Design a protein around this ligand. Structure first.
Ligand SMILES: NC(=O)c1ccc[n+]([C@@H]2O[C@H](COP(=O)([O-])OP(=O)(O)OC[C@H]3O[C@@H](n4cnc5c(N)ncnc54)[C@H](OP(=O)(O)O)[C@@H]3O)[C@@H](O)[C@H]2O)c1
Ligand SMILES: COc1cc(Cc2cnc(N)nc2N)cc(/C=C/C(=O)N2N=Cc3ccccc3[C@@H]2c2ccc(C)cc2)c1OC
Length: 162
């Protein structure tokens, strides 16, 4: 399986100055539970922002840098390399990788952050006409998670004769 994994706000902002614009622990827990035991594919900037590999999953970084080498990280240099990765692969970010892959993935795990943040990087536009809502689950709010958010699992609709 090839999936997108992303959090975007009401205007599809995903980032600001190489950071997440929001503080939302529950979304990072969501990410953890979905991706443990599987594979994350991320662009170089997204990796440098996180700074280290995330434990208990395969960490794959796409970069043109032939000198790139980080302990605990596998490196690829082409989009085509993604299709040779075994198992359930999650496209993890950032904007560049989402743009390159949104037309190629089977499904998307999207956290909709129900707010409007300042951003400098965006998830590409998409329409629910093309995507079936396999599930939509409201995140629970509390002391440490104060921004309303919704977990969407979207599956690409098949084109059929009407
Ligand atoms: N909200 C979310 O869910 C989420 C998730 C992830 C990231 N983010 C945010 O997204 C932002 C970063 O996105 P970004 O687009 O600026 O950077 P990015 O996609 O994280 O990484 C860009 C880099 O990926 C490498 N790359 C991409 N496509 C390639 C290809 N076809 N071949 C070879 N290398 C390729 C290049 O690395 P080299 O330049 O080294 O060649 C490129 O400069 C950050 O603000 C981050 O916080 C948000
Ligand atoms: C640009 O910065 C980032 C971008 C993304 C991508 C992303 C985020 N959200 C959604 N919905 N999709 C995505 N593709 C993740 C992160 C976060 C990574 C990150 O520390 N943990 N994660 C998974 C994980 C697994 C095992 C141990 C620890 C972690 C860690 C983490 C987990 C839970 C809490 C409460 C706190 C921290 C990130 O750094 C802030």
């Amino acid at each position: 399986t090839l999936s997108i994994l992303v959090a975007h706000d009401l205007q599809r902002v995903i980032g600001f100055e190489n950071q997440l614009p929001w503080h939302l622990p529950n979304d990072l827990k969501h990410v953890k539970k979905l991706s443990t035991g599987h594979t994350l594919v991320m662009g170089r900037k997204t990796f440098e922002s996180i700074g280290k590999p995330l434990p208990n999953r395969r960490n794959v970084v796409l970069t043109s840098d032939t000198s790139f080498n980080v302990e605990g990280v596998d490196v690829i240099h082409s989009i085509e390399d993604i299709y040779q990765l075994p198992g359930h692969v999650f496209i993890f970010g950032g904007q560049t990788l989402f743009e390159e892959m949104i037309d190629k993935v089977d499904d998307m795990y999207i956290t909709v952050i129900e707010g409007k943040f300042r951003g400098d990087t965006f998830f590409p536009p998409y329409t629910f006409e093309d995507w079936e809502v396999a599930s939509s689950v409201e995140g629970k709010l509390d002391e440490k998670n104060t921004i309303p958010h919704t977990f969407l699992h979207l599956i690409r609709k098949k084109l059929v004769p009407r």
